[PDB]
Amino acid sequence: NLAPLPPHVPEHLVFDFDMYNPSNLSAGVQEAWAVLQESNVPDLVWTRCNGGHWIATRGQLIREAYEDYRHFSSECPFIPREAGEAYDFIPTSMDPPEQRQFRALANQVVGMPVVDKLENRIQELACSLIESLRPQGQCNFTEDYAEPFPIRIFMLLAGLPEEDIPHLGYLTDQMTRPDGSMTFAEAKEALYDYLIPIIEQRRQKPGTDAISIVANGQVNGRPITSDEAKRMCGLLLVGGLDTVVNFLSFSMEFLAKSPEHRQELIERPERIPAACEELLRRFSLVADGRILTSDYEFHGVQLKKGDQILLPQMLSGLDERENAAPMHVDFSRQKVSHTTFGHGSHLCPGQHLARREIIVTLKEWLTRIPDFSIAPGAQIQHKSGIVSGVQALPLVWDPATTKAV
Ligand code: HEM
Ligand SMILES: CC1(C)[C@@H]2CC[C@@]1(C)C(=O)C2
Ligand SMILES: [C-]#N
Ligand SMILES: [K+]
Ligand SMILES: [K+]
Ligand SMILES: [K+]
């Protein structure tokens, strides 16, 4: 279950952290990962879990490694190694310079101009969901809002039918938080196979949706191939169907549990964008990594060619060296430092869509359903993985306190 220590890895750096089932999970997932930042724990450790890999535990090291693509390559960015080796998504599995032509196309389909284009749709969807939900006095938040709000927006953006959401959500779940029904590679291939006939249909007759744009793109002075388009659309789907969905649940769980923080935003709505950034720091949720292109000494530690190193995006903003009292949510925090959207050349291009979705959710939910709580009895369970998430979030409220605008 624990893989034997490789000869080059010193024993005193061993810390057996399981990224898919961390010891302290019951305390909350961010808290569970934060054990890597207790004072005894070295800045850079090796876990024997999940095949054996390095973990950088401080924001300083995490940022530094993400800037150095020469040594820390994204060709194999997932743990376990078998998943990383099968990982061939575009642009994420590519380093500069090769990454750049494909990254331009990815940004074209999720960037700010798309957010601006979809402004009314995003607003309308949040409004419609909340209006349907508010008179009920309860919801399963993950299922009833956290999933459908960003996913319907993504399927819209992608020109894909909503009928396919359960299938696609399942497949993407398996690549970030596998339940054991599928390997990463099996889930990837299933997603690729879903997309290829759609890509083939849309290559011929080009359109406005993300899949058409990718499929009709130009890269390296030539048409993008169907297979390249497949590798990129696959990534876009993983990106569009997981991170915002799970982040919204962390944020709403917190708000459900902190009336004082709800009040701040209700009474001072101009603070919502800042609050969004602080929630992005505190409830950061992504952890992937890189692979060593050659033997390299890093912060006094001998990394060997082929070693995998987890560089948890989640940990930077929780580092007390970066943010004092890091587990405390302060919407008035002066310098919100985080790498929630990553760092280096793979810095998330979808972050503007994400922020808009978070901000619209905060504004509309908190004003229409200002007063809500976790259902009595309930204990909220988190799950850990490449993207961490909330399993279920039962909320209750008095419908009489709710607003239609
Ligand atoms: C709270 C929301 C989000 C979070 C925390 C997040 C996080 C991240 C992180 C950490 C990376 C870099 C991974 C790495 O360096 O290996 C990334 C990349 C990426 N994200 Fe997001 N993201 C969010 C929203 C979105 C959305 C809404 C989309 C829409 C499609 C999206 C699309 C992408 C794409 C295409 C990449 C790959 C960029 C590249 O490889 O050059 N993201 N994201
Ligand atoms: C780690 C990510 C968040 C980033 C975009 C989707 C994701 C799961 C990837 O495979 C790359
Ligand atoms: C990005 N997801
Ligand atoms: K050793
Ligand atoms: K790979
Ligand atoms: K998913």
Curated annotation (Swiss-Prot):
Does Heme appear among the keywords? yes
Names of the cofactor(s): heme
Per UniProt, subcellular location reads as: Cytoplasm
Pathway of action? Terpene metabolism; (R)-camphor degradation
What broad class describes the main subcellular location of this protein? cytoplasm
The molecular function GO annotations come to: camphor 5-monooxygenase activity; heme binding; iron ion binding
GO cellular component labels: cytoplasm
The intrachain disulfides are: none
EC number(s) for this protein?
A: 1.14.15.1
**Keywords tagged on the record:** Cytoplasm, Heme, Iron, Metal-binding, Monooxygenase, Oxidoreductase
Annotated residues that bind heme are located at C348
Annotated GO biological process: (+)-camphor catabolic process
Tell me the enzyme class.
oxidoreductase
| SUPFAM superfamilies for the chain | Cytochrome P450
> Catalytic activity annotated for this protein?
2 reduced [2Fe-2S]-[putidaredoxin] + (1R,4R)-camphor + O2 + 2 H(+) = (1R,4R,5R)-5-hydroxycamphor + 2 oxidized [2Fe-2S]-[putidaredoxin] + H2O
Q: Which family does it belong to?
A: Belongs to the cytochrome P450 family.
Role played: Involved in a camphor oxidation system.
This protein's name: Camphor 5-monooxygenase
Species the sequence originates in: Pseudomonas putida (Arthrobacter siderocapsulatus)
